[PDB]
Amino acid sequence: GFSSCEVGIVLNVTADHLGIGDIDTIEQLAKLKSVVAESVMPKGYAVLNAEDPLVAAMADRVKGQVAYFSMDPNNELLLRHTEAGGLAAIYENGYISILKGDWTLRIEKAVNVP
Amino acid sequence: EYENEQAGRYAARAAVRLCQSIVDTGTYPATELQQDLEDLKELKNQASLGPSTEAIVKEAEARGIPWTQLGARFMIQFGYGVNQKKIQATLSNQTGILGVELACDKEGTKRILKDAGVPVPRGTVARYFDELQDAIEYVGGYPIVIKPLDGNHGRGITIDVKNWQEAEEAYDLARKASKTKTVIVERYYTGKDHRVLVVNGKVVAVAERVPAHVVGNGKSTIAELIEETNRDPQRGDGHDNILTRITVDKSALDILGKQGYSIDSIPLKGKKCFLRATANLSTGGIAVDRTDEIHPENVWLLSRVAKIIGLDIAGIDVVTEDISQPLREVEGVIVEVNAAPGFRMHVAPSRGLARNVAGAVMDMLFPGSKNGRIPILSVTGTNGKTTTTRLLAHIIKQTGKVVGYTTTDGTYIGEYLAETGDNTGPQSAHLILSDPTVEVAVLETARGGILRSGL
Amino acid sequence: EYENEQAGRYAARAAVRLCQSIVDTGTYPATELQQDLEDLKELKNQASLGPSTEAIVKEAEARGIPWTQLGARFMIQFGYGVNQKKIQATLSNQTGILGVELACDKEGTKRILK
Amino acid sequence: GFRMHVAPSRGLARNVAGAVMDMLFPGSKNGRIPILSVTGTNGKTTTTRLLAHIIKQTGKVVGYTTTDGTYIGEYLAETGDNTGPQSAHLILSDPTVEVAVLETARGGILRSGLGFSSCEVGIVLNVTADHLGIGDIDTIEQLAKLKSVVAESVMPKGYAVLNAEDPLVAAMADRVKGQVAYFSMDPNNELLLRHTEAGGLAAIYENGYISILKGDWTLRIEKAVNVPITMAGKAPFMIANALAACLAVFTQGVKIEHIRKGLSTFVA
Ligand SMILES: Nc1ncnc2c1ncn2[C@@H]1O[C@H](COP(=O)(O)OP(=O)(O)OP(O)(O)=S)[C@@H](O)[C@H]1O
Ligand SMILES: Nc1ncnc2c1ncn2[C@@H]1O[C@H](COP(=O)(O)OP(=O)(O)OP(O)(O)=S)[C@@H](O)[C@H]1O
Ligand SMILES: Nc1ncnc2c1ncn2[C@@H]1O[C@H](COP(=O)(O)OP(=O)(O)OP(O)(O)=S)[C@@H](O)[C@H]1O
Ligand SMILES: [Mg+2]
Ligand SMILES: [Mg+2]
């Protein structure tokens, strides 16, 4: 519905309903969902799930910065991404934390959020 | 390539001497090599910035803000022209003289804070012995604290006294140690000492100082742990590391004598046993981060205190039993305010998350996504440098802007000649970029200037 | 009416003593009168602002700007709330520590100016 | 020291202090903030708290002092009585306060006088001879003369909010510098109606409504049954306080929707 988006979030790709239209494979589903990520302006951000191999594979062919989020604090891809640059989000010790490189910014305890 | 100018020049001079010696005799004496290395280390240590200003400069470089070193008083200048700021260590060019002078005055600071309703320790001043007993019922009983009016490094100050004779001897010690013969007595407040850092009226980091101590959880006593801690790589001396080596001094020996145990006395169950009670990092204590555990009302109160005193970067000392509760329910108090604090303990807490203090300082100095840059136009060539420079300056002057430009005739700032001579090298470009009134810079860059000292 | 609080209270206390003495004995000793006047002059000189801050306060009063006297270090506060300023003698609350320290250093000031 | 320039002895004197004051306060401005002083006999504290809550709807930090304590925004700043001039200095010296609301008690005026020179708004609720003989106030005329200090100490561009149903309070209409705004629980008060015909700024309770009269125009605020403090309009003492609180902020340019939102959510 538009040309460029300032922020593009991709949550997950799961083959649950298939056979609709010309989409018959999870690779085609990922290729279709990649439209949002690829249509991000050079100064925008693409937020991606680091725990999904298909979503993380959209890291390439993206104009603009990439920010990973992961429910596992020990994701090797996310940790390697933070070492040179940053902007990740993890759930480390009952906390919702933002990693801006080598700095950790704790938001909330994840039990005070209804 | 060099990192320090003098060190690089010395190494360049020494390399040819070493080569001449080795081609003349076949080897170089080891003593001369050791002398050269120690001289190089001395030059490296001579031209080195402090642990705080270097941390700030690292953030300034990362954000792409130009920085130069002034030659007056170890001051550093960020930015160019009308967009420049200056810092010395933690003091900025906007820190007020009145705020620093008020913070350095303990008794006036306490009165000002009390008039504003901030909880401060209840105390009294005394100059004669007969008055002492009177002050005792004014503060509310025991325990009490005896301190001098003016002192450095804690001269003649007691911590906890609970009877008459110790109070009298502490009073005599303080009176003979104080420069004005007079002594303040406060009520003693129990709790954990906290150090709060306030930048731009916002709390950045909170740390709790745990005094130097050892825990016998490994079925080992003090005698081994004193040196076991000293062998940890985190410990160090100087002004760079938080954790200093555990100094077993005569005063420290007496303090651990007042503990009630011995050197070889094994701790029971593996419980903390302390070596001193001052709760200072110089003694060898540790810091614990508590930034996420602070109550919002305490944050508001400390932000208000920092503005009442009038400091943009401040370090406040708090004595309370728990920082997670407001300072009214618990008998928490504000002990002192420091004008030029060192954030060295907040970037390496050793028992928590590190905070980016330098990022906050840069966010205060340069608020938005901006740097301290001004338009720079550099003209080079072979034939028409001066005429083009003057024409560019005249064209820009039509816009209501102050233009600083350097040519072969001289260095001009606006309409008045600022310096005479050739002035086409990098040494005359610093005069233009450091003026607090220049908005646009026009520079004639000659060939000799590039060859001699670079751009 | 009084101009200085302590001096006014002292004069009020001394007036009744003088009246009692004169109604009891018919006159008042001149030495006591001289003592009272010199004491009043001492109180007047004790609570007096410097020649610079009083000149600034006179202009502040003429412009209708409220002013109070802080109890810390002879500082004067103009205004209320978020619109307040502070002066000591000629130093304001915006005068920088770095500038004053550099000005107090003759040799560094000369190098910077050169 | 610039004092060698103000008396050269061989030339023209220069106004250095004028330059210093022009640097500290650049334009034609002073260091003043809005001050609302509430006085009376019965409803000082409730009116002070309601005024503070109404102003808080605008994005401003309000410092107010009542009998319960001294508050700066949302956090308690000091405990105790705090209704005298000594507690007014804490509010006016805070570097974060933008509006000041002060409950001015009688004992504070008698003991040390008023805590300021001029106030933007002065509210007088009522004068009732209930406690008498304290100090040298032994007549209701002296009590009215004492309470008149707040009304008479209003700057020429300020407002004096007065109760039209009190013959003693309404008598303070004279010897007041600045405009006068009446409030009354009886919509047919002849003095208020005559006041609105030439000018305006009155507040009445006409038909189950809290109304502002700006001359010949009526601006209805609320139905007086949706205001929790009135207890569905059963307590007549609370509506009198609400009228004064709304009229005080209306004269200062506060929007109607802010007044309505503040009045609808205030809890005792
Ligand atoms: N009322 C009190 N209750 C508890 N601890 C207190 C109290 N007063 C002082 N202290 C402690 O004693 C210390 C005294 O502050 P100091 O910083 O030592 O003052 P000082 O004499 O200026 O020494 P320096 O030069 O500033 S390090 C505080 O930091 C607290 O740890
Ligand atoms: N574009 C050009 N091409 C060739 N000659 C030129 C040009 N512009 C100027 N000249 C000649 O060069 C002379 C000197 O040039 P300037 O205007 O002084 O610039 P300049 O290079 O800064 O001078 P210098 O370096 O101090 S000798 C002029 O008087 C002209 O005669
Ligand atoms: N306008 C009013 N007329 C008559 N009585 C009133 C009025 N407003 C309030 N009251 C009554 O007076 C009581 C006390 O008023 P408060 O709200 O405490 O104001 P207050 O005058 O600050 O209180 P004080 O002075 O500390 S006793 C209330 O509980 C009501 O019963
Ligand atoms: Mg030339
Ligand atoms: Mg009350």
From TrEMBL, chain C:
- TM helices/strands, residue ranges: none
The subunit field of the Swiss-Prot or TrEMBL record says:
Homodimer.
Physiological role: Catalyzes the ATP-dependent polymerization of arginine and aspartate to multi-L-arginyl-poly-L-aspartic acid (cyanophycin; a water-insoluble reserve polymer).
Q: Which family does it belong to?
A: In the C-terminal section; belongs to the MurCDEF family.
UniProt-recorded name of the protein: Cyanophycin synthetase
Q: Where the shown chain sits in the full protein?
A: 115 to 228 of 902
